[PDB]
Design a protein around this ligand. Structure first.
Ligand SMILES: O=c1c(O)c(-c2ccc(O)cc2O)oc2cc(O)cc(O)c12
Length: 275
């Protein structure tokens, strides 16, 4: 599939930088014809077949195809796609309140503040999983707030660079995100399904409540070793005044066997979550 090959600067003015990754930069922009504002992601294309600098077109097309499916308040939307010889440029929905990650660093949350975020994340993931879409890169850096200066911030899930459709209950591709948040099946190179995101959600919830990362070791390999061995515990110093029901929620997500792990529908019916 090809995209719009006009010069993006003919239609948009860029401004402040919003995000920056391995082969991509995200820039605030304004569409000339409407005055409406967006976030433009410039993804570097592969220049040769066997290269490792830039993103394969197969991966770019998978990501664009998944993004075009999305219309939900808790998930980022895609407006347009441009390309040239060097880049594919995604015109994405603008979210101006920064990462949940940096929001958390400004402060630990109460359980209520924790669940106001979590409920939105869960609703977003419920939408995604209903479309059989596995995100595979859920973490606080990939959760963006619309406005961080409100009591109950609204969030959107971003970064579908590792996302895959799961038409057969499981996928077996080259998939590997951030060690602190990846499920054991990812660490062990097993077939992956929607269950992996649920594990990530348990890690996120642990972090929201405690301000601590449950599997983090002194190095990437140690973290992965801890993940596979399910080497985590609720430290009394962090959780002594956290409800046992919140611990139950997390404990039912941080399960090694994906088949025994809570599904997104289960997580929504959990007493800690359910009204
Ligand atoms: O950092 C962003 C981002 O990675 C992404 C992003 C979204 C989808 C995707 O598939 C890949 C991305 O990097 O979107 C953003 C949108 C914004 O309004 C602001 C942002 O900082 C980002």
């Amino acid at each position: 599939t090809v995209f719009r090959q006009e010069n993006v600067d003919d239609y948009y003015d860029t401004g402040e930088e919003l995000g920056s990754g391995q082969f991509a930069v995200v820039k605030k922009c304004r569409e000339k014809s409407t005055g409406l504002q967006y976030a433009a992601k410039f993804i570097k294309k592969r220049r040769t077949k066997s290269s490792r600098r830039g993103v394969s077109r197969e991966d770019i097309e998978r990501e664009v195809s998944i993004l075009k499916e999305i219309q939900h308040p808790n998930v980022i939307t895609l407006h347009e796609v441009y390309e040239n010889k060097t880049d594919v440029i995604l015109i994405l929905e603008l979210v101006a309140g920064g990462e949940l990650f940096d929001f958390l660093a400004e402060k630990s949350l109460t359980e209520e503040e924790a669940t106001e975020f979590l409920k939105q994340i869960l609703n977003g993931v419920y939408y995604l999983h209903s479309l059989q879409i596995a995100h595979f890169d859920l973490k606080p850096e990939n959760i963006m707030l619309l406005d961080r200066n409100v009591p109950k911030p609204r969030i959107k899930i971003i970064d579908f660079g590792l996302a895959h459709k799961i038409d057969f209950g499981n996928e077996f591709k080259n998939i590997f995100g951030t060690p602190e948040f990846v499920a054991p099946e990812i660490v062990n190179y097993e077939p992956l399904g929607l269950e992996a995101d649920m594990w990530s959600i348990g890690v996120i919830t642990y972090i929201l409540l405690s301000g601590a990362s449950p599997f983090l070791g002194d190095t990437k390999q140690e973290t992965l070793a801890n993940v596979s061995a399910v080497n985590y515990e609720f430290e009394d110093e962090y959780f002594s005044n956290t409800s046992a029901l919140a611990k139950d929620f997390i404990r039912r997500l941080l399960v090694k066997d994906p088949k025994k792990r809570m599904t997104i529908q289960d997580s929504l019916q959990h007493p800690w979550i359910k009204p």
